[PDB]
Amino acid sequence: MQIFVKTLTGKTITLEVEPSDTIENVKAKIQDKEGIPPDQQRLIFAGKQLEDGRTLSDYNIQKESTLHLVLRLRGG
Template identity: 35%
Template sequence: MASTASCLRVNVHYEKWEPMTFTANMEDRVKKISEHVRSKTKVPVQDQVLQLGSKTLKPHRKLSSYGIDKKTTIHLTLKVVKPSDEELPLVLVESGDEGQRHLLHVRRHSSVAQVKEMIESKTGVTPEKQIVTCNGKRLEDGNTMANYSIRRGTLLFLTYHCIGG
C-alpha cells in the first residue's frame, strides 16, 4: 500500500471546463493523468497535451521525473489538439514489379488534389494519370484525407490510367 507521503494533488485546467482535481502517486506516468482527463471530458488521450508551466509532459514519463515536490499541488494546463491539425505520415506504394514506396507527409485536412500533387513531385506521374486507392476505395478529387478516415501509417496505392489499352 502506498503511503500518503508519496501522493500529491493534481489540478488540470482547460479553458472550457471547470478545473479537475486528481490524487496521484509520484511514480504514476503522465498517461495515467491523461486517462483521468479522458474519463471526465471524453477528449481522447492522443488529442491531449498536458503542460506544467512551459514544459510539455511526455506520456511515458513518471510525474517524479519532472522534479515535482510531493507536498504541493501541481497545476497542469490541458491543450486539445484538433484532429484536423494532425500530420499523417503515409506510405505510397506504386504499382509495378518493383512496388516502389514513398513517404508522404500530409495532414488530415489535405485534399486529394493536394496529395496527388505531392505524388507527382515524388513519382513524376501527373495527377490526371493517377489512380490512388486506400482500403479498397478510390480517392476522389474534392475530398480530404479525413473523408476517408485515413490514419497515420496508412498505405496508399498508386496505379496509372492506361490510354489505348
C-alpha cells in the same frame, strides 16, 4: 503526418500528408514527388475510389493509409 505509397521502385515511397488535406492536393503531392502527372497517378484508399474534393479527416488514415498507386492500359 506521413503515409506510405506502394509504387515504382525504391522500397515504398513515403509521403508527407496531414489528416486535413484534400485528395486533389494529395494526388498532386504524390504525383509531384513521384515526378509523374495525374494522368497516371491513381489515388485509391483502402479499395475505394476518391472524390478529389474530399477531406483527409473523412478518408481517415495514419500509416494503414498506404494508399498505393496502380497504372496499366493508360499511359502509352
